[PDB]
Amino acid sequence: DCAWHLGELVWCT
Amino acid sequence: GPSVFLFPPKPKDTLMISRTPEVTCVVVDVSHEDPEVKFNWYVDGVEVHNAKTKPREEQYNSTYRVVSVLTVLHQDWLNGKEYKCKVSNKALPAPIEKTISKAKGQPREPQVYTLPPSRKEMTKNQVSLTCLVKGFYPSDIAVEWESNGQPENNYKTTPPVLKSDGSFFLYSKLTVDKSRWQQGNVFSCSVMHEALHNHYTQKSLSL
Amino acid sequence: GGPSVFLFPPKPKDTLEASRTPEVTCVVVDVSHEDPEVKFNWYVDGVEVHNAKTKPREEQYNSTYRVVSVLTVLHQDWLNGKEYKCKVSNKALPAPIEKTISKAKGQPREPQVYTLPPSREEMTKNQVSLTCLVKGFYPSDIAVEWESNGQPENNYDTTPPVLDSDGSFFLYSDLTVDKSRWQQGNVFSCSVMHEALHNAYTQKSLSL
Numbered sequence: 001d002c003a004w005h006l007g008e009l010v011w012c013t
Numbered sequence: 014g015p016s017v018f019l020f021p022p023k024p025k026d027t028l029m030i031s032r033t034p035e036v037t038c039v040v041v042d043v044s045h046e047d048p049e050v051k052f053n054w055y056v057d058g059v060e061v062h063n064a065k066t067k068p069r070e071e072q073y074n075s076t077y078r079v080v081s082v083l084t085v086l087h088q089d090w091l092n093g094k095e096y097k098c099k100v101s102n103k104a105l106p107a108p109i110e111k112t113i114s115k116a117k118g119q120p121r122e123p124q125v126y127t128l129p130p131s132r133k134e135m136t137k138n139q140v141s142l143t144c145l146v147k148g149f150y151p152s153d154i155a156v157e158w159e160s161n162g163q164p165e166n167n168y169k170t171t172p173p174v175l176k177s178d179g180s181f182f183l184y185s186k187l188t189v190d191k192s193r194w195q196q197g198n199v200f201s202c203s204v205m206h207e208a209l210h211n212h213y214t215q216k217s218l219s220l
Numbered sequence: 221g222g223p224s225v226f227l228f229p230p231k232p233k234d235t236l237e238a239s240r241t242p243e244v245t246c247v248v249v250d251v252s253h254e255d256p257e258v259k260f261n262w263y264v265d266g267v268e269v270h271n272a273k274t275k276p277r278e279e280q281y282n283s284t285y286r287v288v289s290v291l292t293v294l295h296q297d298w299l300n301g302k303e304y305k306c307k308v309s310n311k312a313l314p315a316p317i318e319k320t321i322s323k324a325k326g327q328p329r330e331p332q333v334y335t336l337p338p339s340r341e342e343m344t345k346n347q348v349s350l351t352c353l354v355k356g357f358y359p360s361d362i363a364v365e366w367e368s369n370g371q372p373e374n375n376y377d378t379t380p381p382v383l384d385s386d387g388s389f390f391l392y393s394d395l396t397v398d399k400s401r402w403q404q405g406n407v408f409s410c411s412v413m414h415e416a417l418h419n420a421y422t423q424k425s426l427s428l
């Protein structure tokens with residue numbers, strides 16, 4: 001579970 | 014003599030693991046004669062040694078501004094560990110200590126809703142796309158707009174407003190050409206907040 | 221040092237509602253104890269006026285006094301752009317301090333007022349948000365309210381104005397109501413007061 005923001009890595013559980 | 018101010022990291026820097034958050038200890042009214050400053054940094058009362066001093070800057074009232082910067086860990090910050098700056102200087106009878114942490118209190122999740130422009134707005138060349146972000150806490154948030162994986166140029170977000178239940182809300186307004194709206198193009202509202210799963214969420218809007 | 225002057229405008233709502241009292245407010249702070257006397261002179265478009273109400277010295281307990289002079293303005297005068305000057309004299313100043321304020325200057329623009337229902341997604345909760353988008357207005361002076369069936373709706377929050385990229389202003393207002401009321405079809409109204417509207421007033425309804 002990773003969230004990405006405009007190709008930039010926000011956070012993974 | 015000198016005054017000390019302690020500043021938190023930027024919200025995004027704490028939320029995005031690919032970024033580096035830092036607390037900043039700022040010392041003003043340092044004198045021309047005793048310009049030496051000694052910083053001691055503690056994380057929950059345990060000393061750390063990884064801070065670095067920014068270059069010293071002379072002001073127009075001819076005092077120096079002296080600054081120490083400390084890299085913090087995202088989760089320590091998010092877990093609400095306390096950061097303490099201790100400043101020593103000869104002009105100072107005793108060292109000055111300031112303490113910073115994340116906003117105290119149980120985080121609450123941003124409920125995020127997209128709202129299409131009014132029918133009554135279809136008259137004008139440009140229509141408004143609205144993202145309502147409410148019930149969040151703390152107020153540290155970031156909110157941006159995008160279409161087909163690209164940031165939209167023309168949007169404005171209101172600053173967070175404290176509701177009477179103790180949480181914050183804000184609205185973000187996207188302004189696009191009526192065409193783009195009318196021809197089915199999909200627009201997305203992106204929110205970063207510690208209390209969201211993966212500090213993120215995205216809600217979409219199209220005709 | 222010496223005293224400092226701050227000059228505050230009337231509240232937008234006060235300048236837009238006839239039944240309300242708009243006031244310009246001159247506040248002098250850092251008045252010493254050894255030189256406590258303060259003189260106020262007031263002007264409206266360079267013409268001195270004599271009916272300001274000045275209040276006695278207020279002890280601040282930080283070594284200083286605070287003194288306030290309050291000028292009641294005519295609604296039409298604030299709205300037509302009259303300038304208001306507060307001149308403050310005190311023995312610790314080398315020269316008196318003059319400050320002036322007026323309504324913002326610039327071509328006034330009519331507020332576009334759009335109501336927006338709660339999201340479908342919001343229907344899982346007790347309470348829903350009703351939105352009033354007010355945009356494109358200038359100047360930033362404005363008042364927003366809500367009502368249903370001739371009775372005022374109090375449970376709302378309004379953002380301050382935000383400067384838009386075309387130099388005009390917008391804001392949003394969220395009226396938050398028990399979901400049942402929305403679902404009934406109950407009609408809610410967003411009220412906007414602003415100088416550039418006809419009658420300085422407008423009312424857009426929101427229902428199912």
Ligand SMILES: *[C@@H]1O[C@H](CO[C@@H]2O[C@@H](C)[C@@H](O)[C@@H](O)[C@@H]2O)[C@@H](O[C@@H]2O[C@H](CO)[C@@H](O[C@@H]3O[C@H](CO[C@H]4O[C@H](CO)[C@@H](O)[C@H](O)[C@@H]4O[C@@H]4O[C@H](CO)[C@@H](O[C@@H]5O[C@H](CO)[C@H](O)[C@H](O)[C@H]5O)[C@H](O)[C@H]4NC(C)=O)[C@@H](O)[C@H](O[C@H]4O[C@H](CO)[C@@H](O)[C@H](O)[C@@H]4O)[C@@H]3O)[C@H](O)[C@H]2NC(C)=O)[C@H](O)[C@H]1NC(C)=O
Pocket residue numbers: 016018020021022023034035036037039041042072073074076078
């Ligand atoms: C001699 O001169 C100096 C200043 O030099 C002058 O600056 C101005 C006035 C010019 O017009 C010129 O005259 C000169 O160049 C005087 O130093 C000032 O002293 C003040 C105390 O007397 C002090 O006031 C306190 O400021 C706090 C907020 O400061 C912010 O915001 C202002 C802008 O609003 C900004 O100017 C400051 O630099 C500071 O900015 C923040 O810096 C942080 C840390 O770097 C930034 O965040 C970090 O940075 C990076 C990003 O680049 C990264 O993301 C990091 O992760 C992150 O941590 C942040 O982005 C900056 N913010 C902004 C908005 O830009 C107030 O909070 C504080 O209030 C509190 O304390 C008061 C008590 O005094 C209380 O009343 C109050 O209630 C609060 O408790 C103070 O008001 C000034 O900051 C300070 N100015 C500077 C530039 O250092 C000096 O006083 C003067 N001496 C004499 C004898 O005259």
Ligand SMILES: *[C@@H]1O[C@H](CO[C@@H]2O[C@@H](C)[C@@H](O)[C@@H](O)[C@@H]2O)[C@@H](O[C@@H]2O[C@H](CO)[C@@H](O[C@@H]3O[C@H](CO[C@H]4O[C@H](CO)[C@@H](O)[C@H](O)[C@@H]4O[C@@H]4O[C@H](CO)[C@@H](O[C@@H]5O[C@H](CO)[C@H](O)[C@H](O)[C@H]5O)[C@H](O)[C@H]4NC(C)=O)[C@@H](O)[C@H](O[C@H]4O[C@H](CO)[C@@H](O)[C@H](O)[C@@H]4O)[C@@H]3O)[C@H](O)[C@H]2NC(C)=O)[C@H](O)[C@H]1NC(C)=O
Pocket residue numbers: 224226228229230231234242243244245247249250280282284286
């Ligand atoms: C001794 O004490 C006094 C008194 O202060 C109080 O008690 C002390 C002990 C402390 O606890 C204080 O915290 C207490 O407030 C000190 O006086 C203060 O000095 C400051 C300057 O050093 C001065 O700062 C300037 O504030 C301006 C805004 O003032 C607003 O907002 C603040 C809150 O942010 C609020 O505290 C003020 O009262 C004032 O609030 C507005 O008042 C007006 C007038 O009533 C209201 O308008 C009227 O409202 C009525 C209804 O009541 C009616 O509707 C009328 O129609 C309408 O006119 C308005 O509603 C109020 N607004 C709000 C939000 O409440 C700033 O704008 C200004 O910014 C400037 O600062 C710099 C330059 O100076 C620049 O960086 C910048 O560009 C700006 O130019 C200043 O910060 C304080 O206002 C002043 N406090 C008071 C109460 O007068 C004194 O300094 C201290 N001395 C010493 C030596 O310690």
